[PDB]
Ligand binder design. Structure first.
Ligand code: NA
Ligand code: NA
Ligand code: NA
Ligand code: NA
Ligand code: NA
Ligand code: NA
Ligand code: NA
Ligand code: NA
Ligand code: NA
Length: 462
């Protein structure tokens, strides 16, 4: 990804986008009870905690583009991957508006809580001012779409989330893009069926985990990932994607049945126009996280990338025995024979990608079912039912999360959510977590599930 042009918004007639100022994250009643090091990400230039230039830090993910054409390795990779997807019989037919906007199996209704993007954000118009869940009205929507059309600027916001001491100090806050309501809907119509199929088929055929439920999916992963595990990370995956990978995505989407016209939206994602506070800029390359389907498209592209690197380094590799599952930039895969991830990583650097050892490790050490993680969770087979696998979210992360809140009125829901993640760490660990929660008055006012109940429902869910 590369920023090709940036100027002050007023010069082009765009009003300043009034993003927040203060973080919505505040210390929760459990802040003192549990230990933690993370803090809200920097949101403004003057943050006292900064030890670097903020503006410069947040745009540093756009490391540039390796300009190249789709080589022979990418072609074979697309072919093989496309071969897998064909098996799913993905409908390239547009999804009817009501399904694409208000919900259907495989595709949750459009979030009425998030930004409507441009120009609505400048006209004080919210999603709820156009859509209504109980009415499923589409008259105003059709009104707005016809009026403003498609291909509108994206609104760039700084993600208000917890970050490590280092990320805060370096001001490395994440940037998310809010696509215009018009574009979100148009895309959901265009790729709605693809989204649905992916959501209903997490695994090694889609090569995607987007929309999976760790409680159930974890026990299927080891069955799917047969051989020697392969796992590594990316640094700034999204912003590092070069136009070439989008070209690959378009080829694969076309092998699926989509027409050149329908894949034009991929161009919308690749060559974007952004509005960030008082600035407005153009970007070439990079996946604009936040727009419709970016998680699924990041996953699809990752399936092409890894296959591409494997073919380039290991000429003579048999992809038919290769297995992988991606959730955006997070990857976990297997091959019957050992593979040197460091070699793949260097080959990636040649394609403008920054790959590193799984979980910030020293080296591309042996990945095992004991140390491997996916979606930040570890894998631990149940002691009594070996075929059932526990998705283990580190208690450390649970502790970090419970110490803050964006809205105290959601404590009951927040804490219960954490409980659903914590018990997988074992009964002793669970009991301590519960004891400390109850060491605060609010804690004794919450309806917290008992371990034995969590275990029983989990076992019964299969
Ligand atoms: Na603690
Ligand atoms: Na360029
Ligand atoms: Na070539
Ligand atoms: Na391994
Ligand atoms: Na979407
Ligand atoms: Na999704
Ligand atoms: Na080889
Ligand atoms: Na039992
Ligand atoms: Na966390």
């Amino acid at each position: 990804g590369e920023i090709e042009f940036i100027e002050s918004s007023k010069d082009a007639g765009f009003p300043v986008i009034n993003t927040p100022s203060k973080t919505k994250l505040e210390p929760s009643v459990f802040h003192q009870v549990f230990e933690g090091n993370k803090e809200p990400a920097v949101l403004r230039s003057g943050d006292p905690r900064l030890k670097a230039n903020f503006e410069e830090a947040i745009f540093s993910k756009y490391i540039g583009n390796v300009n190249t054409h789709v080589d022979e390795y990418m072609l074979e990779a697309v072919d093989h991957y496309a071969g897998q997807l064909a098996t799913l019989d993905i409908s390239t037919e547009p999804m009817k508006l009501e399904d694409a906007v208000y919900g259907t199996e495989g595709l949750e209704a459009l979030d009425l809580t998030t930004s409507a993007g441009y120009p609505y954000v400048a006209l004080g118009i919210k999603k709820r001012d156009i859509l209504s869940k109980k009415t499923k009205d589409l008259t105003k929507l059709k009104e707005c779409m016809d009026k403003y059309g498609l291909n509108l600027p994206m609104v760039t916001y700084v993600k208000d989330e917890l970050r490590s001491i280092e990320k805060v100090a370096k001001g490395k806050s994440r940037l998310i893009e809010a696509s215009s309501l018009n574009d979100s809907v148009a895309m959901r119509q265009t790729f709605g069926n693809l989204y649905k199929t992916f959501h209903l088929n997490p695994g090694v055929v889609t090569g995607s985990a987007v929309g999976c439920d760790p409680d159930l999916f974890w026990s299927k992963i080891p069955v799917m990932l047969d051989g020697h595990l392969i796992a590594f990370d990316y640094s700034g995956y999204d912003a590092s994607l070069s136009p070439v990978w989008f070209a690959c995505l378009k080829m694969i989407l076309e092998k699926l049945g989509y027409t050149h016209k329908e894949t034009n939206y991929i161009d919308y994602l690749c060559n974007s126009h952004h509005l960030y506070r008082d600035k407005h800029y153009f970007v070439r390359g990079g996946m604009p996280s936040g727009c419709s389907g970016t998680s699924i498209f990041n996953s699809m592209i990752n399936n092409i990338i890894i296959r591409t690197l494997m073919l380039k380094v290991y000429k003579g590799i048999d992809l038919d025995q290769f297995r992988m599952i991606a959730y955006g930039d997070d990857v976990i895969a297997s091959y019957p024979w050992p593979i040197d991830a460091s070699l793949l990583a260097e080959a990636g650097k040649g394609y403008g990608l920054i790959m590193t050892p799984a979980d910030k490790g020293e080296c591309f050490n042996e990945v095992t079912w004991t140390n491997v993680t996916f979606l930040k969770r570890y894998f631990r087979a149940d002691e009594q039912y070996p075929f059932l696998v526990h998705p283990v979210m580190p208690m450390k992360d649970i502790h970090e999360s419970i110490r803050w809140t964006k809205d105290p009125k959601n404590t009951q829901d927040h804490v219960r959510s954490l409980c659903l993640l914590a018990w997988h760490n074992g009964e002793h660990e669970y009991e301590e977590f519960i004891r400390k929660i109850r060491s605060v008055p609010v804690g004794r006012c919450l309806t917290l599930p008992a371990f034995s109940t969590l275990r029983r429902k989990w076992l019964d869910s299969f």
